[PDB]
Write an enzyme that holds these catalytic residues in place. Structure first.
Site, PDB file in Angstrom:
ATOM      1  N   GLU A 357       0.803  -1.213   0.000  1.00 14.64           N
ATOM      2  CA  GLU A 357       0.000   0.000   0.000  1.00 14.64           C
ATOM      3  C   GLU A 357       0.843   1.273   0.000  1.00 14.64           C
ATOM      4  O   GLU A 357       0.503   2.242  -0.673  1.00 14.64           O
ATOM      5  CB  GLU A 357      -0.970   0.001   1.177  1.00 14.64           C
ATOM      6  CG  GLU A 357      -2.044  -1.094   1.097  1.00 14.64           C
ATOM      7  CD  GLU A 357      -2.912  -1.003  -0.151  1.00 14.64           C
ATOM      8  OE1 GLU A 357      -3.335   0.116  -0.510  1.00 14.64           O
ATOM      9  OE2 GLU A 357      -3.187  -2.052  -0.770  1.00 14.64           O
ATOM     10  N   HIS A 487     -16.233 -10.473 -10.675  1.00 16.88           N
ATOM     11  CA  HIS A 487     -15.899  -9.560 -11.777  1.00 16.88           C
ATOM     12  C   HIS A 487     -16.786  -9.687 -13.010  1.00 16.88           C
ATOM     13  O   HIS A 487     -16.974  -8.714 -13.753  1.00 16.88           O
ATOM     14  CB  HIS A 487     -14.439  -9.749 -12.160  1.00 16.88           C
ATOM     15  CG  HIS A 487     -13.523  -9.803 -10.983  1.00 16.88           C
ATOM     16  ND1 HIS A 487     -12.565  -8.842 -10.737  1.00 16.88           N
ATOM     17  CD2 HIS A 487     -13.424 -10.703  -9.976  1.00 16.88           C
ATOM     18  CE1 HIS A 487     -11.911  -9.151  -9.629  1.00 16.88           C
ATOM     19  NE2 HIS A 487     -12.413 -10.274  -9.149  1.00 16.88           N
TER      20      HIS A 487
HETATM   21 ZN   LIG Z   1      -2.846  -2.795  -4.362  1.00 19.64          ZN
END
Ligand SMILES: [Zn+2]
Ligand SMILES: *[C@@H]1O[C@H](CO)[C@@H](O)[C@H](O)[C@H]1NC(C)=O
Ligand SMILES: *[C@@H]1O[C@H](CO)[C@@H](O)[C@H](O)[C@H]1NC(C)=O
Ligand SMILES: *[C@@H]1O[C@H](CO)[C@@H](O)[C@H](O)[C@H]1NC(C)=O
Ligand SMILES: [Cl-]
Length: 597
Positions: A357, A487
């Site tokens: 992150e 998805h």
């Molecule tokens: Zn990521």
């Protein structure tokens, strides 16, 4: 005035207005994800709707400037992004129906449930429940029950909706000057008007297929090895030469084989490196975790986190009375405001997620000077490749040592190595064929090469041939098995997981060569290498201002997606696999099925 200098003035007005409305909308969303409140959801939804309405007026106001009458490629990009109609190219009654269909498919997916045959009142949602089972159960029948029920009860509800959906979507796409909805998606890799870096939409399909061919040997051997391990786990249920039954792979679809680790681990006696205990004994906390991640980047020439990142970030769960969404996330709110939202726990896993992150933030900071519309990864698959690259270096035994979280007493064996590479391959390699095959099926469906009456037939024909996986039960056209995947029913393109995976290893091989790494690629750590951080930063600050083919080149010295680095990463496991399969059947027959008898 020229429809270039006025386009430049139009764009200048947009960036200042957009930067401000996006900031208001971002701040609102941040409040709601950090302090779930009823008025905070209100403030957010409204700030968000103000942004969408601005984006629409601005889009249908940029049309005015003839794309061809444009010269400055940088202004074309921005103008390009903006004058994209999309669904608004549909007649109100169509757009309304399409939105209804999307919302409906979405809700039946997140709210559908299956109930126990021996107890109609015991019902499970996909999450958790069916997922918990598909990931942890070792009972052939229970897993089969969950696999088939999910597809039989909810998948079938999706069938009708999905068909209408492709129609409406292909219509949007054609009217937007694309062949079909799938051609529309490949539009993310297309780059034009740049000699030497151009790239066609159809060219994506062939580079994927060409690179996939080179991955097949590694996969087949991975397949033969786990197929033999699953035979011990499910005695008499699987053929030595057949495809793997779809319901025995570790998750509801076989997207990743991650959970097959306990059944396939090469040397179960060797300890799996895990410092989630050494962190505790050293009294480590969220701050130390992110401070160590910050130190990792500075070590290669990147900047410290900003003042404010540390003050505005929610690095820990506020506990009770402060409900918040804990999904780790990196935020680029605008106007130099960067933040990470994560309910950090003192585990090895969260120490790696922090690096991943913080990798995103770094990328966001590097291209903050680009105009608003060019602030994003070179293409759909760059940001996560950049994030994944950071965990790779941070988990290496060599990194954990220099950090003091792993003692120099933990000897690395050729076995702890294969154990690590196999674990990596179950997630990384196992998903490549699954990902390519799923998108191929959609590409073909959107092109109209698979008649509604052959959708499932072709789906399972393709699962058997490309993935080497077979359905436990036969499915007619009444089912819609691809739609039982998030998805698919939630309308997100999937090929990005294929490309990002190949990019991450190209980046990593490149950075490690720039770091003068000596042994096997999987042991590399880019810490201390400003030469690595410089090469990384040359493409990072580009945002999407250059063709992705050039951003790649700035880092790996080549303009295209290449699979060799992925293969180099796994070479040690690949040679071990071959030797393990010395007497096994490598590959599969598409005839066998659990019910053939
Ligand atoms: Zn990521
Ligand atoms: C495009 O325009 C920007 C500012 O409007 C300018 O700085 C840039 O040099 C132009 N791109 C080129 C080199 O044609
Ligand atoms: C968007 O639609 C408008 C009107 O329907 C049209 O004039 C414009 O060319 C379209 N945008 C493009 C260039 O695709
Ligand atoms: C990064 O540089 C510091 C500064 O000397 C050094 O102590 C650290 O070990 C380096 N990281 C590694 C493991 O190369
Ligand atoms: Cl499926």
């Amino acid at each position: 005035s020229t429809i270039e200098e006025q386009a430049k003035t139009f764009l200048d007005k947009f960036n200042h207005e957009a930067e401000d409305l996006f900031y208001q909308s971002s701040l609102a969303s941040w409040n709601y994800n950090t302090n779930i409140t009823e008025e905070n959801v209100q403030n957010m939804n409204n700030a968000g709707d103000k942004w969408s309405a601005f984006l629409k007026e601005q889009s249908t106001l940029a049309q005015m400037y003839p794309l061809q009458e444009i010269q400055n490629l940088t202004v074309k990009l921005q103008l390009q992004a903006l004058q994209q109609n999309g669904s608004s190219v549909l007649s109100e009654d169509k757009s309304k129906r399409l939105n209804t269909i999307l919302n409906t498919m979405s809700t039946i997916y997140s709210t559908g449930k299956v109930c126990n045959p021996d107890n109609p009142q015991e019902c499970l949602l996909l999450e958790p429940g069916l997922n918990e089972i598909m990931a942890n159960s070792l009972d052939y029948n229970e897993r089969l029950w969950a696999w088939e029920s999910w597809r039989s009860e909810v998948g079938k509800q999706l069938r009708p909706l999905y068909e209408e959906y492709v129609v409406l979507k292909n219509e949007m796409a054609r009217a937007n000057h694309y062949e079909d909805y799938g051609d529309y998606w490949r539009g993310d890799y297309e780059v034009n008007g740049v000699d030497g870096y151009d790239y066609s939409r159809g060219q994506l399909i062939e580079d994927v297929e060409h690179t996939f061919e080179e991955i097949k040997p590694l996969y087949e051997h991975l397949h033969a090895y786990v197929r033999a391990k699953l035979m011990n786990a499910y005695p008499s249920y699987i053929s030595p030469i057949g495809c793997l039954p779809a319901h025995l792979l570790g998750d509801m679809w076989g997207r990743f084989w991650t959970n097959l680790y306990s059944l396939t681990v090469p040397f179960g006696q060797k300890p799996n490196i895990d410092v989630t205990d050494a962190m505790v004994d050293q009294a480590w906390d969220a701050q130390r975790i992110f401070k160590e991640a910050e130190k990792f980047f500075v070590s290669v020439g990147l900047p410290n986190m900003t003042q404010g990142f540390w003050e505005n970030s929610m690095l820990t769960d506020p506990g009770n009375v402060q409900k918040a969404v804990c999904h780790p996330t990196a935020w680029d709110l605008g106007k130099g405001d960067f933040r990470i939202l994560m309910c950090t726990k003192v585990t090895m896993d969260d120490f790696l997620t922090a690096h991943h992150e913080m990798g995103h933030i770094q990328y966001d900071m590097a291209y903050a000077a680009q105009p608003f519309l060019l602030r994003n990864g070179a293409n759909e698959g760059f940001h996560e490749a950049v994030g994944e690259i950071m965990s790779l270096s941070a988990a290496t035994p060599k990194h954990l040592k220099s950090i003091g979280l792993l003692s120099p007493d933990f000897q690395e064996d050729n076995e702890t190595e294969i154990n690590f590479l196999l674990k990596q391959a179950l997630t990384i390699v196992g998903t490549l064929p699954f990902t390519y095959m799923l998108e191929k099926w959609r590409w073909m469906v959107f092109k109209g090469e698979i008649p509604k009456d052959q959708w499932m037939k072709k789906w399972w024909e393709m699962k058997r041939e490309i993935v080497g996986v077979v359905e436990p039960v036969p499915h007619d056209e009444t089912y819609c098995d691809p739609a039982s995947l998030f998805h698919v029913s939630n309308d997100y393109s999937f090929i990005r997981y294929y490309t990002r995976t190949l990019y991450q290893f190209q980046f990593q091989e490149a950075l490690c060569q720039a770091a003068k790494h000596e042994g096997p690629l999987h042991k590399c750590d880019i810490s201390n290498s400003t030469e690595a951080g410089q090469k990384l930063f040359n493409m990072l600050r580009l945002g999407k201002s250059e063709p992705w083919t050039l951003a790649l080149e700035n880092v790996v010295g080549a303009k295209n997606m290449n699979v060799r680095p992925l293969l180099n990463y796994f070479e040690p496991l690949f040679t071990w696999l071959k030797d393990q399969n010395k007497n096994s059947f490598v590959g599969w027959s598409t005839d066998w099925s659990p019910y053939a008898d």
